[PDB]
Design an enzyme around this catalytic site. Structure first.
Site, short mmCIF file in Angstrom:
data_model
loop_
_atom_site.label_atom_id
_atom_site.label_comp_id
_atom_site.label_asym_id
_atom_site.label_seq_id
_atom_site.Cartn_x
_atom_site.Cartn_y
_atom_site.Cartn_z
N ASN A 1 15.24 27.88 1.61
CA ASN A 1 15.02 26.66 0.82
C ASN A 1 14.03 26.85 -0.31
OD1 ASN A 1 15.09 24.80 3.96
ND2 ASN A 1 16.77 25.49 2.68
N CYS B 1 20.16 17.59 2.99
CA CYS B 1 18.79 17.80 3.49
C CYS B 1 17.92 17.80 2.23
CB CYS B 1 18.67 19.19 4.14
SG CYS B 1 19.97 19.67 5.33
N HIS C 1 10.49 20.50 11.08
CA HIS C 1 10.42 20.84 12.49
C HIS C 1 10.66 22.30 12.87
CE1 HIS C 1 14.59 19.47 11.64
NE2 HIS C 1 14.95 20.38 12.53
N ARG D 1 14.34 15.77 3.29
CA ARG D 1 14.19 14.88 4.44
C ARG D 1 14.20 15.60 5.77
NH1 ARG D 1 18.64 14.54 7.55
NH2 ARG D 1 20.56 15.32 6.54
N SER D 2 14.74 16.81 5.78
CA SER D 2 14.84 17.62 6.99
C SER D 2 14.61 19.08 6.70
CB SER D 2 16.22 17.46 7.62
OG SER D 2 16.11 17.40 9.03
N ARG E 1 9.95 11.10 -17.69
CA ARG E 1 9.56 11.09 -16.29
C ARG E 1 10.79 10.76 -15.42
NH1 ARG E 1 6.08 6.82 -18.64
NH2 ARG E 1 3.94 7.58 -18.95
N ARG E 2 11.98 10.94 -15.97
CA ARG E 2 13.24 10.65 -15.31
C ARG E 2 14.12 11.85 -15.01
NH1 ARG E 2 14.44 5.60 -19.36
NH2 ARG E 2 12.34 4.73 -19.11
N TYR F 1 26.68 20.03 -2.52
CA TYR F 1 25.80 20.24 -3.68
C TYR F 1 26.45 20.51 -5.02
CZ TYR F 1 22.26 20.29 0.01
OH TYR F 1 21.45 19.97 1.07
N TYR G 1 12.35 24.34 15.99
CA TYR G 1 13.12 24.24 17.22
C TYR G 1 12.40 25.05 18.26
CZ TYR G 1 17.06 21.64 15.29
OH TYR G 1 17.79 20.63 14.70
N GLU H 1 24.84 31.62 -3.10
CA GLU H 1 24.96 30.20 -2.83
C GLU H 1 24.59 29.37 -4.07
OE1 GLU H 1 22.15 28.41 0.01
OE2 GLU H 1 23.72 27.12 0.77
N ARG I 1 19.17 15.58 17.85
CA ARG I 1 20.62 15.61 17.74
C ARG I 1 21.25 16.66 18.66
NH1 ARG I 1 23.87 17.05 12.34
NH2 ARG I 1 25.35 18.56 13.19
N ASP J 1 13.79 23.05 8.63
CA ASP J 1 13.81 23.90 9.80
C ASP J 1 12.91 25.07 9.47
OD1 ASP J 1 14.42 25.12 12.21
OD2 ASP J 1 16.54 25.46 11.70
N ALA K 1 19.77 27.05 16.37
CA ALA K 1 19.63 25.84 17.16
C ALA K 1 20.90 25.00 17.15
CB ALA K 1 18.46 25.02 16.66
N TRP L 1 28.54 28.63 4.84
CA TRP L 1 29.24 27.35 5.00
C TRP L 1 30.55 27.39 5.78
CZ3 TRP L 1 27.18 22.71 2.94
CH2 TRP L 1 25.98 22.90 2.23
O1 LIG Z 1 22.37 21.30 11.76
C1 LIG Z 1 22.91 22.27 11.25
O2 LIG Z 1 24.04 22.18 10.80
C2 LIG Z 1 24.81 23.28 10.22
C3 LIG Z 1 26.03 23.29 11.04
C4 LIG Z 1 26.23 22.25 11.99
C5 LIG Z 1 27.38 22.19 12.79
C6 LIG Z 1 28.39 23.15 12.60
O3 LIG Z 1 29.50 23.17 13.49
C7 LIG Z 1 28.27 24.11 11.59
C8 LIG Z 1 27.11 24.22 10.84
C9 LIG Z 1 25.10 22.86 8.89
C10 LIG Z 1 26.28 22.14 8.61
C11 LIG Z 1 26.59 21.83 7.30
C12 LIG Z 1 25.70 22.15 6.26
O4 LIG Z 1 25.85 21.56 4.99
C13 LIG Z 1 24.54 22.91 6.50
C14 LIG Z 1 24.21 23.20 7.81
C15 LIG Z 1 24.09 24.51 10.21
C16 LIG Z 1 24.68 25.69 9.50
C17 LIG Z 1 23.93 26.83 9.37
C18 LIG Z 1 22.58 26.90 9.92
N1 LIG Z 1 21.74 28.27 9.78
O5 LIG Z 1 20.89 28.41 10.56
O6 LIG Z 1 22.07 29.05 8.87
C19 LIG Z 1 22.03 25.73 10.57
C20 LIG Z 1 20.63 25.74 10.98
C21 LIG Z 1 20.06 24.57 11.53
C22 LIG Z 1 20.84 23.41 11.67
C23 LIG Z 1 22.21 23.42 11.24
C24 LIG Z 1 22.78 24.57 10.70
#
Ligand SMILES: O=C1OC(c2ccc(O)cc2)(c2ccc(O)cc2)c2ccc([N+](=O)[O-])c3cccc1c23
Ligand SMILES: O=C1OC(c2ccc(O)cc2)(c2ccc(O)cc2)c2ccc([N+](=O)[O-])c3cccc1c23
Lengths: 316, 316
Positions: A229, A198, A259, A218-219, A178-179, A146, A261, A60, A23, A221, A315, A82
């Site tokens: 996380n 994510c 992944h 699903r994703s 189990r639900r 969330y 970066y 958070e 992306r 970092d 990234a 955020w």
């Molecule tokens: O791909 C992301 O996206 C967000 C992001 C994307 C575009 C943008 O202009 C502002 C923030 C992201 C967006 C919404 C969310 O619900 C959570 C993350 C982001 C926020 C904070 C961190 N970090 O490293 O702390 C992030 C680390 C890796 C990828 C993202 C990332």
């Protein structure tokens, strides 16, 4: 030690990771299908091989439990995780009258003095969310996030499901079901969302009095994101347990795409050469038992004597 | 061999499974958190150490792809896997005028000649779904079932999401997207459903031309269920690939609660003493490429030379 499963994950995506551009312009190395297991009775899985700010995880998570979707709570705790999601819509509005800020996060990395332009407009956006109620409710509230998807899902016929609150009652009156599942994935909102969840879906489990939680992400970092996380969830498991009067068991982390970066390689490698110290402990206020009403000072971390933080560019 | 990951799972829940009584009177042994990996380039993961009827997996899966929720399609293929879900509502209706059939499946196991009472009323329910259209649309249609949740999700404002169809286009025009996900879990319908989805949510992945799919199954039944489950998904991966012109990679199975009903112990043990044979192969009609319009004879299994079937009572 307790965090070993994390370290083995990085040593892994390095060794086996297929290179996968994505992306953003920053490329990655990614794998599909990984699971981690953390025995919460050996200590709260917060990394010692790198200083992860626990404080932000609390700020958070309680935000989540509160069904909150308004950034003000975070800014009012120094949490700025955020901001970008909201500020983005602010720079877009026909009310906003200042610089360009087009896909800004990237220009701030190839940063001309425009980084200060950004952090300048950000400083005002933040102050105006704190002090101006009307502005806070308009541009601070993310809507789909969330806190609401967990505790305020909307049905077809106009109402709102408190998924978490419900499942907690289920744990209490039907612990073996189990639900015990909560989802943040909604097919109807996903096609247009900025960041679709994510941490897609999670499940509880009770056996021999111990609570366990599996999280499908699903994703991931690996360098920046994963350490946090793991923490939010190890924490969410304890809270759920504290309330249900259950002991704590395991936190099983599941990954779709995990992944690293490409521009975090050196940092992660340098981390792998650090021997971990004994894991910390968590202290949850023993008098309070209804976590929704929990507040910051009801969570304590002990023996967190981590190594220093590792600076790594974000990234984008 | 290819199915080894399955066998290791049973040998595991036996060895480590915590005893866990449940919903039914038949108790179980269960574990939380397991992942299996099958390299689809070494053959379609259909068990050789026990004869699993492939035919039924097809009949059901194509039903799914068709967005179908009406049992007639199945009965019209000799598939009887969902009968009980519909027949149940038929014995409940103020139109049904015959025997008691109260939670029937259980009486048919402690079966007085009432088993034939059951299979008798079932024979009529089935014939009336085939030949009487009005009856088929009323009592044959399950409404909330994979075919519709996959290919006909309903939004808040009156419409219907073809999740699968959409994600397939995504694979084609955005193969690296980390969002190729489809869910069968809907918080609004789950609180009242009969069988909320076991195969909760799945994700696709494309790397170096190969398609991979991970499946989160909150509930599994190691002896009877799992062998089928693996199959539907190994199959669904091939179809998705056939269409997208992609090669096939892996099928990663993920489990929340995986269990062995206490009355399948001996059968599973007896299975573990069977050496597996080389895995079969799958032949997908090379001329047809839009799987939704696929029909039975477009899927072929080769070299499936399994051992005999293993009779094991159903858990209720
Ligand atoms: O791909 C992301 O996206 C967000 C992001 C994307 C575009 C943008 O202009 C502002 C923030 C992201 C967006 C919404 C969310 O619900 C959570 C993350 C982001 C926020 C904070 C961190 N970090 O490293 O702390 C992030 C680390 C890796 C990828 C993202 C990332
Ligand atoms: O717990 C089940 O439930 C059902 C079930 C439950 C009650 C009933 O009166 C009729 C069927 C089930 C119900 C709906 C579904 O969507 C899928 C399964 C079921 C159908 C078929 C099989 N088998 O062994 O083939 C089953 C095997 C294990 C557990 C169940 C099971």
């Amino acid at each position: 030690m307790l965090e070993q499963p994390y370290l083995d994950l990085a040593k892994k995506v390095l060794d086996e990771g297929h290179f996968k551009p994505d992306r953003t312009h920053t490329g990655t190395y990614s794998i599909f299908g990984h699971q981690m297991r953390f025995d919460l009775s050996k200590g709260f899985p917060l990394l010692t091989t790198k200083k992860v700010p626990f404080g932000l995880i609390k700020s958070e998570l309680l935000w989540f439990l509160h069904g909150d979707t308004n950034i003000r709570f975070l800014l009012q705790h120094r949490n700025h995780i955020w901001d970008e999601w909201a500020f983005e819509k602010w720079v877009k509005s026909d009310e906003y009258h200042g610089p360009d800020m087009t896909d800004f996060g990237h220009r701030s990395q190839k940063d001309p003095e425009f980084a200060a332009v950004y952090h300048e407009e950000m400083a005002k956006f933040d102050d105006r969310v704190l002090h101006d109620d009307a502005f806070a409710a308009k541009y601070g509230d993310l809507g789909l996030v969330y806190g609401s998807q967990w505790r305020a899902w909307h049905t077809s016929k106009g109402d709102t499901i408190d998924q978490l609150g419900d499942v907690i009652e289920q744990i209490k009156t039907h612990p073996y079901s189990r639900r015990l599942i909560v989802s943040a994935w909604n097919p109807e909102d996903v096609p247009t969302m900025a960041l679709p969840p994510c941490h897609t879906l999670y499940q509880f489990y009770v056996n021999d009095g111990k609570l366990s939680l599996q999280l499908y992400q699903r994703s991931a970092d690996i360098f920046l994101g994963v350490p946090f996380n793991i923490a939010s969830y190890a924490l969410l498991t304890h809270l759920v347990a504290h309330e249900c009067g259950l002991e704590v068991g395991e936190f099983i982390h599941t990954f779709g795409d995990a992944h690293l970066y490409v521009n975090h390689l050196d940092q992660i490698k340098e981390q792998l050469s650090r021997t971990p110290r004994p894991a910390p402990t968590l202290q949850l206020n023993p008098d309070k038992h209804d976590i929704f009403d929990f507040d910051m000072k009801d969570i304590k971390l002990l023996n967190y004597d981590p190594y220093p933080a590792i600076k790594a560019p974000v990234a984008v």
